[PDB]
Amino acid sequence: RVRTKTVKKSAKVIIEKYYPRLTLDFETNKRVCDEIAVISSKRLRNKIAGYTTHLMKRIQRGPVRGISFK
Amino acid sequence: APVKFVKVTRVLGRTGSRGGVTQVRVEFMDDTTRSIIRNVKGPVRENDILVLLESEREARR
Amino acid sequence: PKVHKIRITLTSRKVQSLEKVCQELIERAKNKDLRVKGPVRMPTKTLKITTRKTPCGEGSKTWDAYEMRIHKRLIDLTAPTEIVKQIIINIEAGVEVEVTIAA
Amino acid sequence: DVLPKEVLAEVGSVKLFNRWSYDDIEIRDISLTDYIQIRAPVYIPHSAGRYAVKRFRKANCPIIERLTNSLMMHGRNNGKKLMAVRIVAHAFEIIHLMTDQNPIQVAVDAIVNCGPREDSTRIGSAGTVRRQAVDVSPLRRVNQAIALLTTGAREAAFRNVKTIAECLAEELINAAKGSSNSYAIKKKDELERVAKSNR
Amino acid sequence: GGVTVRDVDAHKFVAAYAAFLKRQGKLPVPGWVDTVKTGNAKELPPQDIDWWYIRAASVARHVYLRKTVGVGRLRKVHGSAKNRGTRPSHHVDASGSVDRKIMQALEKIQVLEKDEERGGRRITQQGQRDLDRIAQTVAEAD
Amino acid sequence: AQHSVILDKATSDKLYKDVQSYRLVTVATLVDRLKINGALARKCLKDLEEKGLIRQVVGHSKMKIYTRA
Amino acid sequence: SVQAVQVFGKKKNATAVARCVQGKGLIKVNGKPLKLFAPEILRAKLYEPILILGTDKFADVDIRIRVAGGGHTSQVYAVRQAIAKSIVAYYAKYVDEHSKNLLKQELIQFDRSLLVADPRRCEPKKFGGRGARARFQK
Amino acid sequence: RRGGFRGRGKR
RNA sequence: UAAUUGCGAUAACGAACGAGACCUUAACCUGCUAAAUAGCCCGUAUUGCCUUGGCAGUACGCCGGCUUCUUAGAGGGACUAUCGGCUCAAGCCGAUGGAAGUUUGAGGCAAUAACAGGUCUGUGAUGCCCUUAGAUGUUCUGGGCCGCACGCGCGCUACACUGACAGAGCCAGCGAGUACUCCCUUGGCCGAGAGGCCCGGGUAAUCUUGUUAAACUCUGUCGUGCUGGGGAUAGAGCAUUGCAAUUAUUGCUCUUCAACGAGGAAUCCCUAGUAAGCGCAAGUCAUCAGCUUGCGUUGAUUACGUCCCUGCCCUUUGUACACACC
């Protein structure tokens, strides 16, 4: 269960463009992504939502290299 | 024969030519100071209990 | 003007094209104040043919399974005889339709 | 009313088998508990469990279930579990009349006694055997004990006027004590004897 | 309380109807007994001497529970596997004559009648109530 | 190896004075020491049942077992 | 009006639909009572939901069940599943759940499979079930 | 009894 | 990490195939849209028994109500979510919840470079050579491809009592069906049996069809004897398919009653509804399945590993090999 580059690359750009619009809740983050992105599969959308909500959990305690938002 | 009872506290890798044999460190559960190394043939978990016929052979490594 | 309790049967290989045909036909009749009965769902009839891949018999033995599926979605209505002629117009390719007065 | 009068006899008392209760369990040794499961009673052995998914999930299973499955082997008896249950039930009746003790009293001590405590392992020696006489884990000991008991009954009843109901039954009473004239005991002591030589 | 056919065990019920029919002692027999195989799949005639009467009791029992039945359906109901030798076994049906005359002769006993409206044979007004009466002979026999 | 299909007075007397001490009586037991056939064993099995010397434990088309009274 | 609820239980290919109506304590399956419909040795696997719960809790309930499809042992597992689901569902809708929560906890503590089904079907393959044909010389 | 050819060396 | 799948280090930066993604299918929906070629409740008529107020069946309803079960559409659902323990990270182990937590299970498609692999006897795909009117073209009659001192492979039935035989009890699923000539077949009668005659339904969720299959369960006979286990071989008679049945097409009745007591050196397949046991449907078909392709019933022992044997991928290293350790 390792995520490939397409999921990870897409997750990086979403966080920096819309940082405040999505929060620690996985259910809410699922509905933010599909509104502001074009995904042709529900399963692909689910994986994208899973990674981005994990990233902000570790953002909450100290910044991480490779992430920059306004 | 003065048979002794021992208990497993930690498992240290799997030995043998074909992986059948496993190596464990046992505790005599009557004198907590002493501890030795033994060899076992079957599947072993922590807190398992083994019966030892002789307590002077030990094992390599 | 005598009602005859018509029944219409449909057949096609596609599934999306057939469904929207029935969706508009029920609306074409509902607005006309006609008592309409639901679009029943007849069983899909799947037929398959299996044959061996190689044409000569050498090497390993491997087979493949072709498939084909058909759906019906037949519909019936209570209406006079002349009105139904103008209600079944403008049909597209693929779907076959058969009309039965069922008098 | 809705139930037969037979089952009304046991409903007042504690739940148990058709005749016998799983109370008053032996106090004889250690290291064999936690792998023979009697805390949860079962009416009939038959059950569609999930015991073949993990490593030790089958360790938490009634012993009668373990015994019943091993009784059906050798090609002809595949999937005929209903026939096996009939044989098992009758065998518990035979041992009860020949010994006032509980049938589970016979079954438990029989299994715990016919399990080898040492065995020789195969380490390559370029055509020879450097049998190191390793120890045996408790889980394998109970697994092999069930196989030894059942294979003895299948051997005896083959082409014999006797029936499997008591051929299996007579082994259990023999294996309850040090009878030494049973099939299981003959193989168990033989395996331990050769292991001692290769120490 | 009241009892019916479904309220009694099938094995003892058919045996009871064979015992009850001893006292009336009126069932036609066409002389086929003691010679017939009762089926092509078989090799020896049935052991019990009064097999013609036990079979009729069971046959009339299921027709009480089934709505329409003919000779063809009963031919394969009583069929079984056949040992063809060294070839794999198959399924073959029972004899036609055994089941046809055992219920044609049973027609005149006023137990069940024809069903020409759709086919087969159905149970009669007074025929069904007779098999109900013997249920209490078994139910309270306990 | 071969057993006896008929039961004589030399074998009849063994039954009514010896079966009073068995803990279990089965089809195998009769074939064991009286050296008689199984078919004869079944005939003697039911006839002595009603005489009130043995009682049934479990009944089946396959096996019969009896004990003391 | 009349109190009734419908539940169903499934197995490999055995469907057991049941309707529980407020009655007097009568249970019959496929018309016949529980005395008949089972193999003689398999009759034991039908009564467990009764003894663990008690006969006093079936005072005024009537259940009739029709089951078809599958095999002999598959059907008896389906009907025993409908009984467990029927008895707990009727009380939940119409009476206080102090029983229901006590019914649910006790029923699954003895056996979880009484309330949930086991998903198992077969897999098609081009060699048999899962094994291939014999090889000539490896 | 005795086979030649293929890859074999010494003893 | 199942993976050139990633975290990262960096004389490299940015990209293209393969993997993944994806598609079909098996598991979940008391929520939506619904249904007399699918069901239930209800209402009439009606039957038996207790009689109660009941229980179990029949026939009808076509706007009486409804869609849990059946059916096929639109969507929802799992993402490793939450918790505890390691780690900077990617990740791994256990638990709880849950229909489902190995990529959830099983499949389809599937890169570069290659083989003197198979096929001219599938093709009106094809070069060249050969024969073309005493024809290697076509057509009709008959035979052979099945012929048997012997070696080898894929299967079928058994060596029995955990069995055979006899009565009774009685449970599936995937599919197929009428022409310019009859294709699956209900019912009635005759018939030891296989079969025969006469009405009738279905171009098919409507009829065959609930395909009430087999194993299995209950009650009996035989009694360890290669015997009522086993059915090879061979005699006589009665039938169907076809223009034609002998070197028997197949089927039915009586009689004949061989070898075979778990199998040497060697050797194949397989991890959960899986092995094995048992049967059913389809293909080829006027008739013949011990074969294959699919379908369902019953349902286990043991491991949760390693490189010891037979092989595969990457790095360092050696070479007198390059047709490459034959």
PDB file of N, CA and C in Angstrom, chain E residues 12 14 19 50 53-54 58 65 73 77-78 81 91 98 106-107 111 113-114 118 121 128 135 138:
ATOM      1  N   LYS E  12     -43.593 -42.993   9.838  1.00  0.00           N
ATOM      2  CA  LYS E  12     -44.579 -43.757  10.592  1.00  0.00           C
ATOM      3  C   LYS E  12     -45.981 -43.587  10.022  1.00  0.00           C
ATOM      4  N   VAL E  14     -46.924 -43.357   6.764  1.00  0.00           N
ATOM      5  CA  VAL E  14     -47.131 -44.280   5.653  1.00  0.00           C
ATOM      6  C   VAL E  14     -47.207 -45.717   6.156  1.00  0.00           C
ATOM      7  N   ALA E  19     -50.914 -50.341   7.812  1.00  0.00           N
ATOM      8  CA  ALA E  19     -51.544 -51.147   8.852  1.00  0.00           C
ATOM      9  C   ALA E  19     -53.054 -50.958   8.850  1.00  0.00           C
ATOM     10  N   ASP E  50     -45.546 -57.229   1.089  1.00  0.00           N
ATOM     11  CA  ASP E  50     -46.618 -56.263   0.845  1.00  0.00           C
ATOM     12  C   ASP E  50     -46.079 -54.895   0.440  1.00  0.00           C
ATOM     13  N   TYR E  53     -48.665 -52.282  -1.214  1.00  0.00           N
ATOM     14  CA  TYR E  53     -49.544 -51.494  -0.361  1.00  0.00           C
ATOM     15  C   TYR E  53     -48.812 -50.359   0.334  1.00  0.00           C
ATOM     16  N   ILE E  54     -47.540 -50.556   0.682  1.00  0.00           N
ATOM     17  CA  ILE E  54     -46.780 -49.480   1.308  1.00  0.00           C
ATOM     18  C   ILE E  54     -46.488 -48.373   0.299  1.00  0.00           C
ATOM     19  N   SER E  58     -47.690 -44.097   0.391  1.00  0.00           N
ATOM     20  CA  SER E  58     -46.804 -42.950   0.237  1.00  0.00           C
ATOM     21  C   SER E  58     -47.155 -42.134  -1.000  1.00  0.00           C
ATOM     22  N   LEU E  65     -50.255 -33.302  -1.049  1.00  0.00           N
ATOM     23  CA  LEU E  65     -49.469 -32.088  -0.887  1.00  0.00           C
ATOM     24  C   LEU E  65     -49.111 -31.422  -2.209  1.00  0.00           C
ATOM     25  N   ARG E  73     -44.132 -37.529 -14.430  1.00  0.00           N
ATOM     26  CA  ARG E  73     -43.454 -36.917 -13.291  1.00  0.00           C
ATOM     27  C   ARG E  73     -43.088 -37.954 -12.236  1.00  0.00           C
ATOM     28  N   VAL E  77     -39.501 -39.277 -10.357  1.00  0.00           N
ATOM     29  CA  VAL E  77     -39.434 -39.084  -8.913  1.00  0.00           C
ATOM     30  C   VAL E  77     -38.894 -40.340  -8.242  1.00  0.00           C
ATOM     31  N   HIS E  78     -39.278 -41.509  -8.748  1.00  0.00           N
ATOM     32  CA  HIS E  78     -38.847 -42.781  -8.191  1.00  0.00           C
ATOM     33  C   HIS E  78     -37.610 -43.344  -8.879  1.00  0.00           C
ATOM     34  N   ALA E  81     -29.857 -43.720  -9.663  1.00  0.00           N
ATOM     35  CA  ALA E  81     -28.674 -43.986 -10.465  1.00  0.00           C
ATOM     36  C   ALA E  81     -28.611 -45.456 -10.868  1.00  0.00           C
ATOM     37  N   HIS E  91     -28.359 -40.927 -14.384  1.00  0.00           N
ATOM     38  CA  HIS E  91     -29.668 -40.953 -13.743  1.00  0.00           C
ATOM     39  C   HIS E  91     -30.690 -41.496 -14.729  1.00  0.00           C
ATOM     40  N   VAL E  98     -45.614 -49.605 -12.940  1.00  0.00           N
ATOM     41  CA  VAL E  98     -45.817 -49.740 -11.499  1.00  0.00           C
ATOM     42  C   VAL E  98     -46.609 -48.557 -10.958  1.00  0.00           C
ATOM     43  N   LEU E 106     -56.334 -47.378  -7.551  1.00  0.00           N
ATOM     44  CA  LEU E 106     -56.630 -46.550  -6.392  1.00  0.00           C
ATOM     45  C   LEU E 106     -57.690 -45.494  -6.707  1.00  0.00           C
ATOM     46  N   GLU E 107     -57.983 -45.273  -7.994  1.00  0.00           N
ATOM     47  CA  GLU E 107     -59.030 -44.335  -8.394  1.00  0.00           C
ATOM     48  C   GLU E 107     -60.391 -44.773  -7.862  1.00  0.00           C
ATOM     49  N   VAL E 111     -60.361 -42.043  -3.479  1.00  0.00           N
ATOM     50  CA  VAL E 111     -59.358 -41.266  -2.769  1.00  0.00           C
ATOM     51  C   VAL E 111     -58.958 -40.020  -3.551  1.00  0.00           C
ATOM     52  N   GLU E 113     -59.305 -38.147  -7.806  1.00  0.00           N
ATOM     53  CA  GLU E 113     -60.044 -38.177  -9.059  1.00  0.00           C
ATOM     54  C   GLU E 113     -59.254 -37.451 -10.139  1.00  0.00           C
ATOM     55  N   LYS E 114     -59.758 -37.530 -11.368  1.00  0.00           N
ATOM     56  CA  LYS E 114     -59.064 -36.924 -12.489  1.00  0.00           C
ATOM     57  C   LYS E 114     -59.206 -35.405 -12.461  1.00  0.00           C
ATOM     58  N   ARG E 118     -57.140 -29.246 -16.452  1.00  0.00           N
ATOM     59  CA  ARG E 118     -55.772 -28.876 -16.796  1.00  0.00           C
ATOM     60  C   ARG E 118     -54.820 -30.055 -16.930  1.00  0.00           C
ATOM     61  N   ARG E 121     -53.951 -35.733 -11.948  1.00  0.00           N
ATOM     62  CA  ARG E 121     -54.949 -36.233 -11.016  1.00  0.00           C
ATOM     63  C   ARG E 121     -54.885 -35.427  -9.727  1.00  0.00           C
ATOM     64  N   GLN E 128     -59.508 -36.847   0.758  1.00  0.00           N
ATOM     65  CA  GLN E 128     -58.529 -36.180   1.612  1.00  0.00           C
ATOM     66  C   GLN E 128     -58.894 -36.290   3.088  1.00  0.00           C
ATOM     67  N   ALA E 135     -54.460 -39.599  11.125  1.00  0.00           N
ATOM     68  CA  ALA E 135     -53.432 -38.835  11.824  1.00  0.00           C
ATOM     69  C   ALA E 135     -53.611 -38.904  13.336  1.00  0.00           C
ATOM     70  N   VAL E 138     -52.125 -41.829  15.149  1.00  0.00           N
ATOM     71  CA  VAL E 138     -50.689 -41.776  15.384  1.00  0.00           C
ATOM     72  C   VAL E 138     -50.316 -40.659  16.351  1.00  0.00           C
TER      73      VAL E 138
END
